[PDB]
Ligand binder design. Structure first.
Ligand SMILES: Nc1ncnc2c1ncn2[C@@H]1O[C@H](COP(=O)(O)OP(=O)(O)O)[C@@H](O)[C@H]1O
Ligand SMILES: [Mg+2]
Lengths: 120, 236
């Protein structure tokens, strides 16, 4: 029933995060890059977005930025899940509207705890 | 005495971290999922997940062999060992090893010989396979974003009492100021078109040192946005 837009350029990463999300009964739509993600928002409005930073075509900082430029989007919570480990990368993502930033490698169980907290 | 930058060393360190982090993210997430989901995995998905762990370990191992190989060449402790080999099976073997990585990026990989096979040469097969793999790898990593006809091709020929191996791609190409530097240790072109591509900048320095240990040379030709040709000449 709850719908998550999962945005990452690694198929390997998407598979494992989609597996843990569907374990909870969530529905998953995949985007391979940030532009594809923004195009998917015309088909639907997800209850949550899981967002990578480093992606070809359109990165995650740019996604976050544009998400704040439409009003239907600007309110969908976003959890950023990224190999980017700097405090300044985190601050920037938060300043751009992300609700939470988690750094890869990640614990799948901690990640699902945080996904739940944003969906409740 | 001007050789290198300490800043290049700082970027290198950061890059190793970044490149190793990706397969490690997969290993840890897949392993912990299996551990916490035994009742929720069917057998084909359990085996699938274990095969991801294994395949991501193998990628990581390769990245570690690159660091090692480089330190060895650097301290001139890597002595090559030559023998007659058929480069046509060598090149086909290398194209084979790269198919998975390549289709994951929708890159087609071809092999044409201008001369009839086998093309026989006195080379270290292991070290020359490593040269071919770094060029094919590069052709995939640096291929165009969003294109339906992406390719890397190996073209083999016999020239100048030697073998001439060209690896051609239709990828992003290399700006002219960069052609003089790409073979140097730690050097990576830094552009909005390489931001998400991982690497250390060791690949082509290792390739070049290996080619030179055979008394051969490697050079490049490229057009920004058209693609590139790496030329490897080795004596027979
Ligand atoms: N086929 C290619 N097309 C475009 N750029 C390339 C290609 N091969 C190599 N390069 C560039 O040369 C740089 C150095 O290559 P290499 O030494 O293999 O390092 P890495 O792949 O770890 O950066 C790359 O970062 C990239 O900028
Ligand atoms: Mg990414």
């Amino acid at each position: 029933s709850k719908k998550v837009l999962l945005v990452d350029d690694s198929a390997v990463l998407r598979k494992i995060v989609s597996f843990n999300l569907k374990k909870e009964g969530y529905e998953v739509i995949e985007a391979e890059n940030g532009q594809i993600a923004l195009e998917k928002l015309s088909e639907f409005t997800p209850d949550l977005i899981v967002l990578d930073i480093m992606m070809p075509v359109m990165d995650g900082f740019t996604v976050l930025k544009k998400l704040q430029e439409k009003e239907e989007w600007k309110r969908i919570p976003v959890i950023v899940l990224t190999a980017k480990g700097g405090e300044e990368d985190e601050s920037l993502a938060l300043s751009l509207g992300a609700r939470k930033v988690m750094r890869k490698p990640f614990s799948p169980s901690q990640f699902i705890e945080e996904v739940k907290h944003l969906l409740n | 005495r001007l050789k290198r930058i300490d800043r290049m060393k700082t970027e290198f360190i950061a890059n190793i971290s970044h490149e190793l982090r990706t397969p490690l993210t997969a290993i840890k997430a897949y392993a912990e999922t299996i551990y916490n989901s035994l009742g929720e995995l069917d057998l084909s998905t359990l085996k699938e997940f274990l095969e991801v762990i294994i395949d991501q370990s193998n990628h990581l191992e390769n990245l570690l062999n690159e660091l090692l190989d480089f330190s060895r060449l650097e301290r001139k402790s890597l002595q090559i060992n030559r023998e007659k080999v058929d480069l046509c099976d060598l090149v086909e073997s290398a194209v084979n090893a790269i198919k998975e990585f390549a289709s994951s990026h929708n890159v087609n990989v071809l092999f044409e010989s201008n001369v009839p096979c086998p093309v026989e040469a006195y080379i270290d097969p292991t070290r020359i396979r490593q040269v071919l793999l770094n060029l094919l790898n590069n052709g995939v990593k640096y291929s165009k974003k969003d294109a339906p006809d992406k390719y890397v091709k190996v073209i083999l020929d016999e020239k100048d009492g030697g073998v001439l191996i060209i690896v051609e791609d239709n990828g992003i190409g290399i700006p002219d100021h960069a052609k003089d530097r790409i073979f140097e240790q730690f050097y990576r072109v830094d552009s909005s078109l390489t931001y998400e591509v991982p690497g250390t900048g060791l690949g082509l320095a290792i390739t070049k040192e290996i080619v030179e240990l055979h008394g051969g040379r490697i050079w490049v030709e490229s057009e920004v946005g058209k693609g590139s040709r790496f030329f490897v000449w080795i004596p027979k």
